[PDB]
Design an enzyme around this catalytic site. Sequence first.
Site, mmCIF file in Angstrom:
data_model
loop_
_atom_site.group_PDB
_atom_site.id
_atom_site.type_symbol
_atom_site.label_atom_id
_atom_site.label_comp_id
_atom_site.label_asym_id
_atom_site.label_seq_id
_atom_site.Cartn_x
_atom_site.Cartn_y
_atom_site.Cartn_z
ATOM 1 N N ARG A 134 35.646 45.939 68.599
ATOM 2 C CA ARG A 134 36.973 45.375 68.795
ATOM 3 C C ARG A 134 37.969 46.363 68.208
ATOM 4 O O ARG A 134 37.589 47.308 67.515
ATOM 5 C CB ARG A 134 37.110 43.993 68.163
ATOM 6 C CG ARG A 134 38.200 43.170 68.799
ATOM 7 C CD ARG A 134 38.329 41.813 68.194
ATOM 8 N NE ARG A 134 39.598 41.209 68.579
ATOM 9 C CZ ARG A 134 40.745 41.431 67.950
ATOM 10 N NH1 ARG A 134 40.783 42.237 66.906
ATOM 11 N NH2 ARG A 134 41.855 40.847 68.359
ATOM 12 N N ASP A 175 36.981 40.315 60.756
ATOM 13 C CA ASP A 175 37.532 41.647 60.917
ATOM 14 C C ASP A 175 37.263 42.580 59.749
ATOM 15 O O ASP A 175 37.479 43.785 59.891
ATOM 16 C CB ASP A 175 39.048 41.573 61.137
ATOM 17 C CG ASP A 175 39.761 40.958 59.970
ATOM 18 O OD1 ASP A 175 39.164 40.073 59.331
ATOM 19 O OD2 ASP A 175 40.918 41.330 59.702
ATOM 20 N N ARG A 176 36.795 42.075 58.610
ATOM 21 C CA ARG A 176 36.636 42.888 57.404
ATOM 22 C C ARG A 176 35.245 42.629 56.832
ATOM 23 O O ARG A 176 35.054 41.704 56.042
ATOM 24 C CB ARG A 176 37.722 42.570 56.390
ATOM 25 C CG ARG A 176 39.115 42.925 56.841
ATOM 26 C CD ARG A 176 40.114 42.685 55.743
ATOM 27 N NE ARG A 176 39.857 41.439 55.039
ATOM 28 C CZ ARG A 176 40.265 40.251 55.465
ATOM 29 N NH1 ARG A 176 40.937 40.149 56.597
ATOM 30 N NH2 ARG A 176 39.993 39.163 54.763
ATOM 31 N N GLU A 227 50.562 47.504 62.666
ATOM 32 C CA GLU A 227 49.844 47.935 63.866
ATOM 33 C C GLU A 227 50.762 48.669 64.843
ATOM 34 O O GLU A 227 51.022 48.222 65.957
ATOM 35 C CB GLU A 227 49.163 46.744 64.533
ATOM 36 C CG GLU A 227 47.969 46.239 63.762
ATOM 37 C CD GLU A 227 47.379 44.982 64.350
ATOM 38 O OE1 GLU A 227 48.013 44.388 65.237
ATOM 39 O OE2 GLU A 227 46.276 44.582 63.932
ATOM 40 N N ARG A 257 54.419 45.667 65.414
ATOM 41 C CA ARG A 257 54.473 44.223 65.596
ATOM 42 C C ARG A 257 55.104 43.581 64.371
ATOM 43 O O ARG A 257 54.898 44.026 63.241
ATOM 44 C CB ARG A 257 53.087 43.608 65.825
ATOM 45 C CG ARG A 257 52.157 43.782 64.664
ATOM 46 C CD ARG A 257 50.768 43.215 64.865
ATOM 47 N NE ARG A 257 50.643 41.768 64.732
ATOM 48 C CZ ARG A 257 49.500 41.111 64.921
ATOM 49 N NH1 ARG A 257 48.399 41.773 65.232
ATOM 50 N NH2 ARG A 257 49.448 39.798 64.781
ATOM 51 N N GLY A 267 59.681 37.625 63.760
ATOM 52 C CA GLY A 267 60.286 38.079 64.995
ATOM 53 C C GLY A 267 59.272 38.188 66.108
ATOM 54 O O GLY A 267 58.095 38.467 65.884
ATOM 55 N N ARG A 306 46.778 35.248 74.630
ATOM 56 C CA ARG A 306 46.573 36.612 75.105
ATOM 57 C C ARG A 306 45.826 36.563 76.439
ATOM 58 O O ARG A 306 44.647 36.894 76.554
ATOM 59 C CB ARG A 306 45.835 37.434 74.063
ATOM 60 C CG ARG A 306 46.559 37.510 72.748
ATOM 61 C CD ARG A 306 45.688 38.099 71.674
ATOM 62 N NE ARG A 306 46.388 38.179 70.401
ATOM 63 C CZ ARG A 306 45.875 38.714 69.302
ATOM 64 N NH1 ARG A 306 44.656 39.219 69.321
ATOM 65 N NH2 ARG A 306 46.580 38.744 68.185
ATOM 66 N N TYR A 322 44.818 43.462 72.188
ATOM 67 C CA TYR A 322 45.574 44.601 71.694
ATOM 68 C C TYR A 322 45.807 45.606 72.811
ATOM 69 O O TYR A 322 44.921 45.864 73.625
ATOM 70 C CB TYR A 322 44.815 45.280 70.561
ATOM 71 C CG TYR A 322 44.964 44.638 69.210
ATOM 72 C CD1 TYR A 322 45.541 43.393 69.070
ATOM 73 C CD2 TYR A 322 44.522 45.284 68.072
ATOM 74 C CE1 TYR A 322 45.675 42.816 67.838
ATOM 75 C CE2 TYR A 322 44.652 44.716 66.840
ATOM 76 C CZ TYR A 322 45.229 43.483 66.725
ATOM 77 O OH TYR A 322 45.357 42.918 65.482
HETATM 78 CA CA LIG Z 1 55.891 37.727 65.838
#
Ligand SMILES: [Ca+2]
Lengths: 123, 387, 387, 387, 107
Positions: B36, B69-70, B195, B210, B215, B289, B324
């Site tokens: 990923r 992810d870690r 990122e 991002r 925002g 997504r 992504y």
């Molecule tokens: Ca945002």
Amino acid sequence: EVQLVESGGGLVQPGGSLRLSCAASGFSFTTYEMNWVRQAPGKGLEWVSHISSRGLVIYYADSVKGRFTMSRDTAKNSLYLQMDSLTVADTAVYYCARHYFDRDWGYSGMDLWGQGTTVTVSS
Amino acid sequence: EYRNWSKPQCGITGFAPFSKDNSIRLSAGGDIWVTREPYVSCDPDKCYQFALGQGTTLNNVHSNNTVRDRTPYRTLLMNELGVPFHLGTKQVCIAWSSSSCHDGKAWLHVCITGDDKNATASFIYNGRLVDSVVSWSKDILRTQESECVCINGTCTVVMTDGSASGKADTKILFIEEGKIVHTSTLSGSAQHVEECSCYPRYPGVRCVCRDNWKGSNRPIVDINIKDHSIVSSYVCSGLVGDTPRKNDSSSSSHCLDPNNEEGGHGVKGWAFDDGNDVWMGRTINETSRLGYETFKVIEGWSNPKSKLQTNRQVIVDRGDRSGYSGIFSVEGKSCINRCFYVELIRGRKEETEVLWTSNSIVVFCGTSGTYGTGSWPDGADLNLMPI
Amino acid sequence: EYRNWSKPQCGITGFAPFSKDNSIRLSAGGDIWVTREPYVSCDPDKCYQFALGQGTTLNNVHSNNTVRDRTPYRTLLMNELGVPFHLGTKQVCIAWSSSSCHDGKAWLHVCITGDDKNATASFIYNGRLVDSVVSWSKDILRTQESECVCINGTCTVVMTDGSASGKADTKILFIEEGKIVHTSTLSGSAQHVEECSCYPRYPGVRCVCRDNWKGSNRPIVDINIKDHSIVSSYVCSGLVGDTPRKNDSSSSSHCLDPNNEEGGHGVKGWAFDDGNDVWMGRTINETSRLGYETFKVIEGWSNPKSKLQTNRQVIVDRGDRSGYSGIFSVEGKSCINRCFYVELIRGRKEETEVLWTSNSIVVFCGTSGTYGTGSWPDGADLNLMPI
Amino acid sequence: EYRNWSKPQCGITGFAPFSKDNSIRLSAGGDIWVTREPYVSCDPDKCYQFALGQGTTLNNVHSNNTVRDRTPYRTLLMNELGVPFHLGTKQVCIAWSSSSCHDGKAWLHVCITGDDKNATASFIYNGRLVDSVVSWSKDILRTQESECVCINGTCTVVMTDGSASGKADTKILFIEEGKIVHTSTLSGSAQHVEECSCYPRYPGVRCVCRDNWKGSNRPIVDINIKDHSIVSSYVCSGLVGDTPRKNDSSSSSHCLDPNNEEGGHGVKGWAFDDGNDVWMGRTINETSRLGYETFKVIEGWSNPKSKLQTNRQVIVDRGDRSGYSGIFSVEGKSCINRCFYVELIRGRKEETEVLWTSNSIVVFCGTSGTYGTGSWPDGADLNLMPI
Amino acid sequence: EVVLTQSPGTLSLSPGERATLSCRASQSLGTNYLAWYQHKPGQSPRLLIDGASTRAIGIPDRFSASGSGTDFTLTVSRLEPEDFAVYYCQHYGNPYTFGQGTKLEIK
Ligand SMILES: [Ca+2]
Ligand SMILES: *[C@@H]1O[C@H](CO)[C@@H](O[C@@H]2O[C@H](CO)[C@@H](O[C@@H]3O[C@H](CO[C@H]4O[C@H](CO)[C@@H](O)[C@H](O[C@H]5O[C@H](CO)[C@@H](O)[C@H](O)[C@@H]5O)[C@@H]4O)[C@@H](O)[C@H](O[C@H]4O[C@H](CO)[C@@H](O)[C@H](O)[C@@H]4O[C@H]4O[C@H](CO)[C@@H](O)[C@H](O)[C@@H]4O)[C@@H]3O)[C@H](O)[C@H]2NC(C)=O)[C@H](O)[C@H]1NC(C)=O
Ligand SMILES: *[C@@H]1O[C@H](CO)[C@@H](O[C@@H]2O[C@H](CO)[C@@H](O[C@@H]3O[C@H](CO[C@H]4O[C@H](CO)[C@@H](O)[C@H](O[C@H]5O[C@H](CO)[C@@H](O)[C@H](O)[C@@H]5O)[C@@H]4O)[C@@H](O)[C@H](O[C@H]4O[C@H](CO)[C@@H](O)[C@H](O)[C@@H]4O[C@H]4O[C@H](CO)[C@@H](O)[C@H](O)[C@@H]4O)[C@@H]3O)[C@H](O)[C@H]2NC(C)=O)[C@H](O)[C@H]1NC(C)=O
Ligand SMILES: *[C@@H]1O[C@H](CO)[C@@H](O[C@@H]2O[C@H](CO)[C@@H](O[C@@H]3O[C@H](CO[C@H]4O[C@H](CO)[C@@H](O)[C@H](O[C@H]5O[C@H](CO)[C@@H](O)[C@H](O)[C@@H]5O)[C@@H]4O)[C@@H](O)[C@H](O[C@H]4O[C@H](CO)[C@@H](O)[C@H](O)[C@@H]4O[C@H]4O[C@H](CO)[C@@H](O)[C@H](O)[C@@H]4O)[C@@H]3O)[C@H](O)[C@H]2NC(C)=O)[C@H](O)[C@H]1NC(C)=O
Ligand SMILES: *[C@@H]1O[C@H](CO)[C@@H](O[C@@H]2O[C@H](CO)[C@@H](O[C@@H]3O[C@H](CO)[C@@H](O)[C@H](O)[C@@H]3O)[C@H](O)[C@H]2NC(C)=O)[C@H](O)[C@H]1NC(C)=O
Ligand SMILES: *[C@@H]1O[C@H](CO)[C@@H](O[C@@H]2O[C@H](CO)[C@@H](O)[C@H](O)[C@H]2NC(C)=O)[C@H](O)[C@H]1NC(C)=O
Ligand SMILES: *[C@@H]1O[C@H](CO)[C@@H](O[C@@H]2O[C@H](CO)[C@@H](O)[C@H](O)[C@H]2NC(C)=O)[C@H](O)[C@H]1NC(C)=O
Ligand SMILES: *[C@@H]1O[C@H](CO)[C@@H](O[C@@H]2O[C@H](CO)[C@@H](O)[C@H](O)[C@H]2NC(C)=O)[C@H](O)[C@H]1NC(C)=O
Ligand SMILES: *[C@@H]1O[C@H](CO)[C@@H](O[C@@H]2O[C@H](CO)[C@@H](O)[C@H](O)[C@H]2NC(C)=O)[C@H](O)[C@H]1NC(C)=O
Ligand SMILES: *[C@@H]1O[C@H](CO)[C@@H](O[C@@H]2O[C@H](CO)[C@@H](O)[C@H](O)[C@H]2NC(C)=O)[C@H](O)[C@H]1NC(C)=O
Ligand SMILES: *[C@@H]1O[C@H](CO)[C@@H](O[C@@H]2O[C@H](CO)[C@@H](O)[C@H](O)[C@H]2NC(C)=O)[C@H](O)[C@H]1NC(C)=O
Ligand SMILES: *[C@@H]1O[C@H](CO)[C@@H](O)[C@H](O)[C@H]1NC(C)=O
Ligand SMILES: *[C@@H]1O[C@H](CO)[C@@H](O)[C@H](O)[C@H]1NC(C)=O
Ligand SMILES: *[C@@H]1O[C@H](CO)[C@@H](O)[C@H](O)[C@H]1NC(C)=O
Ligand SMILES: *[C@@H]1O[C@H](CO)[C@@H](O)[C@H](O)[C@H]1NC(C)=O
Ligand SMILES: *[C@@H]1O[C@H](CO)[C@@H](O)[C@H](O)[C@H]1NC(C)=O
Ligand SMILES: *[C@@H]1O[C@H](CO)[C@@H](O)[C@H](O)[C@H]1NC(C)=O
Ligand SMILES: [Ca+2]
Ligand SMILES: [Ca+2]
């Protein structure tokens, strides 16, 4: 196999102190968020406290705030709850749980739970 | 020998298909890495694909519950663009966060691994471990997850450390042959930066990041590769590119500040500028997504309050999964071309018929010619694949 | 073209993560060689990993009972650092003991195979079988199991032959383009010398070995690459590095002689010197090969009776399995860097839920920057892997 | 650039282990080609292994009944020496018979395929199909099954066509950059010549062949690479090398003619000369292809009735299976070294617990140093492997 | 705060029809930080639903969930004898809070 084992539950006369100790096997606290959760006899699950993988205590329930202290040892992989000035409302089954903070998605949810330890305040 | 990116930017009217890896489809039969967070970067000869592999293949017992992810096992995998991540893939560092440059002489890898509190960033150049840094904010140290940019031997890497929803320390590191020669703290109007997709806008680097805090528009970091001076702002177009985002009719930007609209989380994405217009890409669904479309907003790099689209393309369909995406620049004969990659995520936490999470990649490049329509999903059928 | 290692030693404040192969995790799905006794060595461009493979993969019927170390089928496998030992791995010689150099022109392989009484060492240089030697003591002829060191084209290999608990003949062989030009018998205060980790301490080679007979401190062999004069002593630090060893509260060293403490067996390890201080690494458990930590003992190369650590790191956790570890040096831009590798052993004779024995590797390199904390175990779950 | 083999022959006191492929052991888990009739050849840099693959892997339904030698599917496989014949192996021509040279510039492959009556030999040089020949005797056209030899760009290939037990037309083809410049019919005292092991005995080529019709001694073909003049004789030693052969006490040779002893069939093998002595290798069992030993017969290249061995080695144990063996020469720094390979055949027609036939290879090279004892069988256990 | 009112205090049903459990939110919350747990007495809690729509690892296919803003729902489409327990809805974003529960009893 991952497991969480709580220990330390016992009779405490009101005004006392007990230390609960959750021992973790199969993973490291350096990547997981750890929680103390309690079910009072007769009531529902209440989130007592939460600690980050990075070591900070993000939350303490209003009742427990000021009386309980939650900490962790990342060498022995242990989680501790130092309860001071225990009242009769604090009699409950205590549970150490584990969830995750993902960089992409965020907080996940408590997927691993311990056996539980009973803390009863008497007289 | 060094790379200086001095040529102009190529005339772009759209993007044409360039590559597809079919990783998940091949994983059903064959040994393919579980990956990923991919990206693409090119040395002056050809292009390479990178990914963060979970230390296991897909038809594997260790493939179960790979949505984290870690972990101590994620490494950085590098192949040529097109070769699927088979078992012969060279994994070039221990990393659960990564970025990669090529300065015209040798590859640079920035690899972050270790504890969430105390994390380590190793800087590897030409097959040597040249430098190393520790977390400054004692939080999840993280980096671009895409290519970094080198100009005249000085490469630039944007690294964030701190809370995902709050004030985090972002720094820009200037590296020379693997050695960190300078470090500039971020300064400007961008509050949360993560990122980043950076590209060489000679004489400097421009990154579109991002905003994971407040925002749905994207931040912009302008790095002066020479004076080491940083400027920050937001993508000014009225059609914002983050997800979650508000619907086209109700969206807004501020061109300086977060819009405070559906800014809770986000997705890594890209954008660049053609004069005053902005070329951008985003997911078709405004909340999940799902899908991926690129288009051009007219006067979108200079005027908030512009919602005029043109040159729209549908790279992945509305009902197909994306993830992504990022940008990378390719030196042409007379100009600099912009390409992007989309990560097509498949598996657990969104499709509960498998126990694993993996991704495929689809790569497009800008073109001055004409192009048609299409849709290039991942194509894997998870109802028949092994759990 | 030749390599002379003339630069100083890099400033080392600690070690940063460099590589991980995830061999056992990938072996659950996919065809991966069954190996043990690995090491790392670098030509002037990149780095390679070597191992002694048992002539079979892990998901194989022949993987059963692979805990032996001397079979006619073990060969020496070589890949680039990072590429797992898949079925495309080139196996470069027949060997159940091995060592490897790169003199700046071509690779040198020393490979031992044969009957325990007769045993032959083939010296292979540039893809030719250049030389060969027979056992002198008519016992198990064996060598460093890590990289050897070349200075000006003259490479040096330490080879032991004789009883593991008793007087054994150790020799230092000086090789030129694969041909053995000289052979020096060991002389000095080190009584038992095995499995040496050698590094170029210009103008010579310094090796830290294991004492498998009467000491838990490590021997030191100083080879003068030029006069072919050998000096022997012991690592002088009060915190000894062999396993089995006594607890830190009650451990001792002699700086000349074995300490006669828990010296029955041992493990291959490393150590080097920074001025008077010693940088060393050992297992965290004092009796089993569990965990791995590196640290610095202040005035530890110069004084027995020093137990002062500093800059401690935990490369593998206390409860995770480790094994052989070793050193290799990498030529930097202005100095010589020291890296080490740890072998993470998994399988039979310590975990009886599988019938095989194999290893993974984790590689760290020294750094002049900062670093964090972490732990990088093997990670394989043997309860679910095929037996 | 061309290779002329001008240096003397290296001093040989014996042979040292050089390589092992473990093909059958790896075939139990993993995808490995089903091969037979292998050999080894080296370009001026490294060495390569070749084999004739049956167009299938071993864990394959098509692996059933692969004991035939002439099928439309057999191709010539080439890897580096050491890399097992995995699925990434490049198969370089259609051939059920083959031979290969390297003239110092490019590889030459002679590949025979087609009908038993009308067969075709393609000559491929530098990746081009340069030439082609048809059967002259309208029978099974066949060639050396080992390396051919080039001197000054002129390569030489020995090709036989005709009855296996009777008069067959053998020719020596002189090839220049893939083009056949000359063809000499065989002339001399050798009646049947097959499967020759050739080596550059500067200024010419010397080949030791098999007599499959009337002799258990081996034929010798001396090719003058320059005058294109051929001489034929027989290996003069009293200890003959073919199998089937008579026992040592009751064996004979003629130095000129077949000895007419147990000469019905045979096996491909090798021999070369050191002054008057002969270095040779043969199977340990006199009737089956079991075991393999090499030794030196004193005055064996000039005197029959000599049965005085010396420097005997047991490469493969008496109870284990061997097969075709052959010679190849390696250019050293100051002399020319001789190496040999042994093919270890496993499977149907001799072990009826499997349905397939394949082979593994073990490679030794001559040494001027010392050596020990050992035995390097294939090691595969066919009772547990898939049928 | 966001008191989460789990709506049906006790539900009794027969092993094999559907069961619609509701979780009310005082004020709207991010619909991806809500989870559903199963507590069987004598057993530790087990996570069923995460992100208000995602079944956990190992949970049967019977349970599915949905939600958005102030409304949340979980249904065990066809009940089973074992699926009788207490069900909690939890908000694990800020502010942290659990629910009081719904008890499924065989009738
Ligand atoms: Ca945002
Ligand atoms: C063969 O392939 C080519 C290349 O792939 C295709 O050509 C491309 O086609 C697309 C789509 O038609 C062109 O996209 C541009 O879209 C702009 C608006 O995008 C629309 O979709 C999005 C997403 O659904 C909506 O957001 C948009 O907005 C809608 O809603 C908002 C409010 O939220 C409203 O405000 C909007 O008005 C919409 O209601 C859009 O629906 C569009 O603005 C842009 O405009 C061009 O075309 C319009 C008429 O369609 C013109 O009036 C305008 O001035 C532009 O005209 C140019 O382009 C056309 C070609 O479409 C030329 O004929 C004209 O001469 C002039 O040059 C445009 O529609 C994309 O630009 C186009 N790319 C090219 C040509 O390179 C072909 O369709 C495809 N054909 C097939 C399938 O066979
Ligand atoms: C974030 O990452 C960084 C980098 O990885 C970490 O920093 C490193 O931290 C380690 C561990 O604390 C430092 O290691 C050092 O440990 C030395 C002793 O070894 C210990 O471990 C072994 C094995 O368990 C034990 O056997 C020893 O115990 C024996 O002695 C202790 C006490 O002596 C007894 O209690 C035991 O029972 C045994 O008898 C040890 O526990 C230690 O000597 C070394 O010394 C520093 O600190 C002491 C004071 O405690 C000073 O006297 C000494 O001079 C050193 O002081 C340094 O630190 C300060 C503050 O940083 C500096 O200002 C000074 O300049 C000086 O550097 C030390 O404790 C390792 O040095 C350190 N590395 C670096 C580069 O900083 C962080 O911990 C980590 N933090 C997280 C998790 O967020
Ligand atoms: C460690 O490794 C080394 C290297 O691998 C080994 O040294 C090698 O050992 C072999 C042992 O035999 C030496 O082989 C030579 O064999 C010759 C042939 O005889 C053998 O084979 C035939 C066929 O198998 C058998 O029939 C023989 O047995 C008998 O039958 C024959 C006739 O059929 C009779 O002639 C015999 O007498 C037997 O009845 C054997 O297996 C052999 O002729 C050759 O001769 C050596 O010894 C004779 C005296 O018998 C001398 O006249 C002759 O000159 C040779 O002597 C030299 O070699 C020895 C070393 O063995 C030196 O000590 C002497 O000084 C002298 O230089 C010989 O036997 C092979 O030569 C040898 N290679 C070397 C040294 O490089 C070690 O054995 C091995 N050791 C361990 C620990 O295992
Ligand atoms: C995929 O990963 C999950 C997470 O590890 C695995 O689920 C877990 O599996 C273990 C082992 O089956 C369960 O432990 C169990 O303990 C009980 C005792 O209370 C015992 O009766 C069971 O036999 C078992 O040993 C664990 O509870 C379960 N946990 C979760 C989160 O569901 C799963 O097994 C893996 N699945 C596959 C198909 O590989
Ligand atoms: C775009 O989103 C806005 C919300 O930001 C939608 O506006 C609401 O829509 C619902 C349903 O029509 C109405 O009940 C609300 O009164 C609207 N509120 C606002 C803030 O305007 C809008 O309808 C969406 N537009 C489209 C076309 O999907
Ligand atoms: C975007 O994705 C969401 C999923 O997050 C879609 O929402 C689904 O819509 C259908 C009805 O259209 C419902 O039956 C599902 O329950 C919804 N949720 C899920 C999780 O599937 C949404 O329709 C998509 N489209 C847009 C543009 O919002
Ligand atoms: C370190 O090891 C020594 C042994 O070498 C331990 O000393 C013994 O410990 C036991 C248990 O406490 C006592 O019964 C003995 O009397 C001790 N004997 C000696 C030789 O001192 C010592 O306790 C160990 N120390 C630690 C901290 O583990
Ligand atoms: C080092 O490893 C040994 C194993 O050799 C550990 O000894 C185990 O200790 C536990 C109790 O702590 C016992 O239940 C086991 O029986 C012991 N043996 C084995 C084989 O598991 C020892 O605790 C480890 N730690 C140290 C520092 O000595
Ligand atoms: C070597 O082979 C010969 C045959 O060529 C054997 O000689 C025969 O052996 C048998 C059994 O001893 C006798 O019955 C015959 O009379 C022998 N005939 C001949 C032709 O001599 C010889 O015994 C074999 N030698 C060894 C040691 O195996
Ligand atoms: C050579 O190989 C043959 C097989 O061709 C061996 O002959 C076997 O001998 C044993 C008794 O020693 C018999 O039980 C078998 O029936 C024989 N044949 C087979 C096919 O196994 C022979 O012993 C071997 N040895 C020599 C030197 O001749
Ligand atoms: C960038 O490099 C190219 C070739 O290396 C050179 O021609 C060009 O002048 C350089 N640009 C600048 C601004 O130096
Ligand atoms: C890049 O290099 C050229 C040649 O050295 C120089 O003229 C130009 O100023 C440089 N630009 C930078 C430092 O970005
Ligand atoms: C070692 O080699 C380098 C480059 O080959 C050279 O510059 C240096 O002088 C050499 N050192 C010595 C001591 O000869
Ligand atoms: C290596 O060679 C250089 C140049 O001949 C010489 O200066 C240096 O001393 C040599 N080093 C050693 C120790 O062999
Ligand atoms: C053979 O070639 C080598 C190098 O190409 C040359 O030195 C030698 O003289 C040549 N031999 C003959 C006989 O021409
Ligand atoms: C090979 O070439 C060299 C140089 O042309 C020549 O001296 C020699 O005679 C030639 N030998 C043969 C065998 O053709
Ligand atoms: Ca010892
Ligand atoms: Ca014959």
